[PDB]
Structure formats: C-alpha cells, structure tokens
C-alpha cells in the first residue's frame, strides 16, 4: 500500500528474476512487480506533495510507472512463452527505469530545472580563473622548497606537503570545468571516474589534515617553547606519512562507489556515486554526514581549540609597548587561518547537510532543492579557493609568524 513498501517489493523481486531457474519463478516475480507498480502509481511521493494531480510533474510520475508496467508485460510474455533466459535479459531494462526514479523523485531530478543555457557560463570561466591563480602561487612554494630554501625546520615540511596537496587538488579544476560544459558527460571512462574521483578526495583531505597539523604545531610552539630549541625534529618524519595514509583511507569509499551510470532523462553518461539502488537514499545521507564530520566538524574543532589555546596563553601576560603590538599581530595571523577555513568550507558543508535531509525526506520543497543545486558549484569553487589562500597565510605572510612568536618570548 505504501510507496516505500511498493519500491521494496519492486527491488526484492528484481533480484528474484536474476536467481530464477524456470519460467514459473520469473512469472511470479513479475506479477508481484506489476501489482506494486500500479499501487505506487496511485500514491503521492514525499517530493512535490503540495501539488494537484493535473500538474505536469504529477502526470510524469504516473507515466514513469506506465513505462515500467509496459516493460514488465514485455518480459511476462517471454516468460509465458517458455523463454526463461530471454525474460531475465529483458528484465535488465527494468533496472534503467528503477535508476530513473531514484535520480528524479528520490533525488533532485524533478525539482531542479533541467534546461541549461550554456553559452560560456560563469562556472567554467570562474573554475579556470581559480585554477591558474592557485597553480601559480603553489608552484612558487614547491619550487622554493626544492632549490631556494631546503629540507630544514619542522613547520617547513608541512608547508611543502600542504603546497603539494593543494597544487594536485587545483590541478583537477580543468577536468570539472570540461565536465560541467558537456552537461555532466564523463568522456574518460568508468576507470578514470574512480581514479580522478579518488585523487580529488585524497588531495582534499591531505590539504585539510595538513592545515590541522599546522594548527597543532603552532599551538605546541606557544605552550611548549622548548620544542623549537630541539636540534632534531623526530616526530615530523612519522606524522607526514600518517596524514597521507589517513587521506588515502578516507578516499576508499570514493574508489568503491564512483562509477559511470547513464542518466535516463538527461540522456547523459555521468560519473556518479553508484550506491546500492535498494538503499540509495540511506547511503547518500550517510556519506553526506561523513563529509561534514570528517571534512569540516573534526578539523574545525582542532583549528578553533588551537586558536583559543594560543589566545589563552598570550592574553594572560598583559603586555605593554612593542610586546603588545607583536602579541596582537600574532593573534591576527592565528585568527586568519580559522576565519579562512570557515568562509571557504562552511557554504559547502551547509548545502551538503541540506542535501542529506532532502535524501532522507526532511526537505521535500522543490524551491529549496533548486537553490541547493545551482549554489553547489559555487560552494565547491569556495573549497578550491582555500587552496589559493593557503600559500599566502602559511608561506608568504605566515613567514614572520615564527619570528614574532620568538619576539614575544625573547
């Protein structure tokens, strides 16, 4: 009777046809699917709930099941004729109609306006602007560590590692700009959908985690000033491989779920997160929650604790003259890294959380969902913009941070 119960019946019986031996097992599973499809056709989905049945989107919902019943009948005729393997092969087309429903009515397909007025759009233009700016500033930091500075100092190792993680992350921007321009048509294959997808997640986490390491190292330098006096930076050689391995382990679900799947309504081959279709909404909300916790929640708490910790040790001294001037300058540099992390990542994680609620069934309003969809590529751009801000805050401007920290300590 219920829409959730009807789609559970449709998915469970699709697996039965695959495991079926004779025509009787195929006929039984198709009849159960035929009854569930006509029952779901009568029901109203959580999305577009406050809409009349005469509406074109409601007419399209009923028509979606008319294609499904028509496809069931074609396979049922082969099953009634004795053709077992032919009916099972015909039942593979039902999976395409099933995937069309999860993309349109469970996803943002029916809400967001599909027609795209692509004529040198702002997204590919802004993506290439951030690319060349970010690539040029990060190349300077990488080339400086190679033949202009050296491999000395604890903090300096993290500067180079953050610059490499940022450079490789910004290097993926021309791919996404081309991917956007072709109306989400992945022209690299299902193998490169996993490769580029994981490479993006790996370098993104490596960037975020090295920012976290910088905050911990900056905090440790204040509370324990004896650490900088140490001739040997023993922990640095073990922290760097651990962070890269943590970024690799975090990019594992990306390598497992990313795959090129055909979008039935758009008529495009998109590199999407191919979760099990029977529990697609649950997986989409779970991974979106994982994005917020691991990529924003845990690092922001670490970055803030380190900032308030430096503020606690500095403000209790009650300085006068140049000691007060140099103190305030250190506090402005320490606040700049926490502020830049918020401005650049908060819009994305808020929209990711709002999108997670849309999958669960909390946000069903198409007006809200349409805004989330068009704002998302701009929010993604802000995440990449953090990689352009990083060389300035840590290498260029943040070079006098260690000198001013040694000035207040004398």
Ligand X SMILES: CCCCCCCC/C=C\CCCCCCCC(=O)OC[C@H](O)CO
Ligand Y SMILES: CCCCCCCC/C=C\CCCCCCCC(=O)O
**Residue numbers of the site for ligand X (CB under 6 A)?**
124, 128, 132, 177-178, 181
List the single partner that 389 binds among ligand X, ligand Y, ligand 8ES, none, CB under 5 to 8 Å by kind. ligand Y
Which of ligand 8ES, ligand X, ligand Y, none sits in contact with 128, Cβ below 5 to 8 A by type?
A: ligand X
Q: Which is nearer to ligand 8ES, 171 or 336 (CB)?
A: 171
Burial class (CB in 10 A: 0-12, 13-18, 19+), 153: middle
Residue 377 in the binding site for ligand 8ES (CB under 6 A): yes
For ligand 8ES, the binding residues in 186-215 under the rule CB under 6 A are: 197, 200-201, 204
In this chain, which of 79, 193, 381, 389 binds ligand Y, going by CB under 6 A? 389
Tell me which residues in 327-386 interact with ligand Y (CB under 6 A). Answer: 336, 339-340, 343
Q: Computed from CA positions of residues 198, 200, 203, 205, in that sequence, does the dihedral angle turn out positive or negative?
A: negative
The interface partner of residue 378, options being ligand X, ligand Y, ligand 8ES, none and the CB cut-off 5 to 8 Å by kind, is none
Q: Which of 291, 334, 389, 394 binds ligand 8ES (CB under 6 A)?
A: 291
Residue 178 binding result from ligand 8ES, ligand Y, ligand X, none, given CB thresholds of 5 to 8 Å by partner type = ligand X
Of 298, 296, 300, the residue nearest 288 (C-alpha): 296
Closest CB to ligand X: residue number: 124
Tokens of 179: 């991917």
Contact 184, 132 (CB under 8 A): no
Strand ranges for 54-202 from DSSP E:
none
Q: What share of the chain is helix, strand, coil (3-state, %, to 5)?
A: 80, 5, 20
In terms of CB distance, is 242 or 343 closer to ligand Y?
Answer: 343
**Is residue 277 a contact partner of residue 98, using CB atoms and an 8 Å limit?**
yes
Q: Closer CB to ligand X, residue 86 or residue 121?
A: 121
Which structure tokens are listed for 174? 């021309």
Contacts of 341-345 with C-beta under 8 Å, sequence gap 24+, read 341/211, 341/299, 341/300, 341/303, 341/386, 342/300, 343/382, 344/382, 344/383, 344/385, 344/386, 344/389, 345/295, 345/296, 345/382, 345/383, 345/386
Interface with ligand 8ES (CB under 6 A), residue from 7, 176, 209, 394: 176
Q: Of 290 and 336, which CB lies nearer to ligand Y in the complex structure? A: 336
Between helices 122-144 and 173-181, what is the axis angle to 10°?
170
Q: Catalog residues that contact ligand 8ES under the rule CB under 6 A.
A: 176, 179-180, 197, 200-201, 204, 250, 253-254, 258, 271, 273, 287, 290-291, 295, 377, 380, 383-384
Q: Catalog residues that contact ligand Y under the rule CB under 6 A.
A: 336, 339-340, 343, 389
């Amino acid at each position: 009777a219920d829409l959730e119960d009807n789609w559970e019946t449709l998915n469970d019986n699709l697996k039965v046809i695959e495991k079926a031996d004779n025509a009787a097992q195929v006929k039984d599973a198709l009849t159960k699917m035929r009854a569930a499809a006509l029952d779901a056709q009568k029901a109203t989905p959580p999305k577009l709930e406050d809409k009349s049945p005469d509406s074109p989107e409601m007419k399209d919902f009923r028509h979606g099941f008319d294609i499904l019943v028509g496809q069931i009948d074609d396979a049922l005729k082969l099953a009634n004729e004795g053709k077992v393997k032919e009916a099972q092969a015909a039942a593979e087309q039902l999976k395409t109609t099933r995937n069309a429903y999860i993309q349109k009515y469970l996803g943002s397909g029916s809400c967001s306006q599909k027609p795209s007025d692509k004529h040198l759009d702002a997204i590919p233009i802004l993506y290439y602007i951030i690319f060349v700016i970010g690539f040029l500033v990060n190349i300077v930091v990488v080339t400086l560590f190679c033949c202009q500075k050296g491999p000395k100092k604890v903090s300096s190792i993290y500067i180079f590692n953050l610059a490499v993680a940022d450079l490789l992350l910004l290097a993926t921007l021309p791919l996404w700009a081309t991917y956007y321009s072709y109306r989400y048509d992945w022209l690299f294959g299902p193998v490169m959908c996993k490769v580029f997808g994981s490479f993006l997640t790996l370098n993104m986490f490596a960037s975020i985690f090295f920012i976290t390491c910088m905050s911990v190292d900056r905090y440790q330098s204040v509370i324990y000033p004896f650490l900088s006096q140490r001739r040997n930076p023993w922990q640095a050689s073990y922290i760097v491989p651990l962070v890269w391995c943590m970024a690799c382990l975090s990019s594992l679900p990306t390598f497992y779920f990313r795959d090129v799947r055909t979008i039935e309504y758009l008529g495009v081959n998109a590199c999407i997160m191919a979760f099990p279709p029977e529990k697609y909404a649950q997986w989409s909300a779970g991974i979106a929650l994982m994005k917020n916790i691991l990529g924003f929640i845990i690092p922001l708490i670490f970055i803030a604790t380190c900032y308030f910790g430096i503020r606690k040790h500095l403000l209790k001294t009650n300085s006068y003259g140049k000691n007060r001037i140099t103190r305030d300058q250190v506090l402005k540099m320490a606040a700049a890294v926490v502020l830049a992390f918020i401005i650049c990542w908060l819009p994305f994680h808020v929209l990711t959380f709002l999108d997670a609620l849309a999958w669960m069934g909390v946000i069903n309003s198409c007006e809200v969902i349409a805004v989330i969809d068009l704002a998302l590529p701009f929010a993604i751009l802000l995440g990449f913009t953090n990689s352009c801000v990083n060389p300035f805050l840590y290498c260029f401007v943040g070079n006098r941070f260690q000198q001013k920290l040694r000035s207040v300590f004398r």
